[PDB]
């Protein structure tokens, strides 16, 4: 790997520089190199890993959506045939996106999840696993769509089970997991009632736990609670 000759601490330092410069591809490459040193990640390092890949795939998803929209318009009644280029370029972006998802899932499977025993690491990585299968599901249309959806659900469910046993309701990782699993239900799994139920139960239980939330996690958790409320407002 191209990062094999760089010190772990230098990779972490450069991932932080890349974040400041909004160079998310570089950030992800640095964090992949750090993971490949074979040591567990600290809490701050997990956050750098997640932010890097979330931003890379986020841009790919935005571009894929633009191109898929064009492609669907091109396949409507009365649209002029303009050849294979829209499909080809959508496929190009899609394959790149799938490659990034596969890279993240490979890091999680070797060997971040196996070695994560504390709830704050295990839930975090399982959430990421669900998220990256969800992004694969967004673009999947072949015979593997159902398996991809099942893999996302299984990861989210294991994370949910651990989070309810081991974390308080206002823990930001627990809240963010529930936010995203609720979106999975609504947008991926054709289960809007489950999505709404999860968002509402999560929000209500977090409210009753606010009297215990730390001032340090308050911004993160209240933001995620607001996102739960935003989704509920969109869905009801």
């Amino acid at each position: 790997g191209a990062m094999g000759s760089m010190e772990r601490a230098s990779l972490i330092q450069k991932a932080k520089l890349a974040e400041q410069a909004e160079r998310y591809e570089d950030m992800a490459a640095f964090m992949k190199g750090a993971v490949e040193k074979g040591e567990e990640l600290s809490c701050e390092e997990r956050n750098l890993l997640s932010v890097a890949y979330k931003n890379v795939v986020g841009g790919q998803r935005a571009a894929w959506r633009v191109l898929s929209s064009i492609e669907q318009k091109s396949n409507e009644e009365g649209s002029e045939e303009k050849g294979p280029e829209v499909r080809e370029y959508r496929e190009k972006v899609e394959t790149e996106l799938q490659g990034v998802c596969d890279t993240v899932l490979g890091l999680l499977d070797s060997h971040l999840i196996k070695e994560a025993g504390d709830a704050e690491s295990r839930v975090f990585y399982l959430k990421m696993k669900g998220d990256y299968y969800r992004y694969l599901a967004e673009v999947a249309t072949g015979d593997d769509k159902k398996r991809i959806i099942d893999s996302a659900r299984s990861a989210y469910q294991e994370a949910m089970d651990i989070s309810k046993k081991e974390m308080p309701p206002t823990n930001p990782i627990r809240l963010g997991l529930a936010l995203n699993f609720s979106v999975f239900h609504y947008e991926i799994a054709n289960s809007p009632e489950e999505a709404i139920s999860l968002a509402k139960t999560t929000f209500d239980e977090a409210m009753a736990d606010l009297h215990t939330l730390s001032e340090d996690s308050y911004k993160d958790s209240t933001l995620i609670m607001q996102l739960l409320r935003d989704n509920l407002t969109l869905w009801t």
Binding site: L179, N180, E187, L223, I224, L227, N231, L234
Partner: peptide, 5 residues
């Protein structure tokens, strides 16, 4: 689209 984190 709905919000995720």
């Amino acid at each position: 689209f709905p919000a995720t984190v």
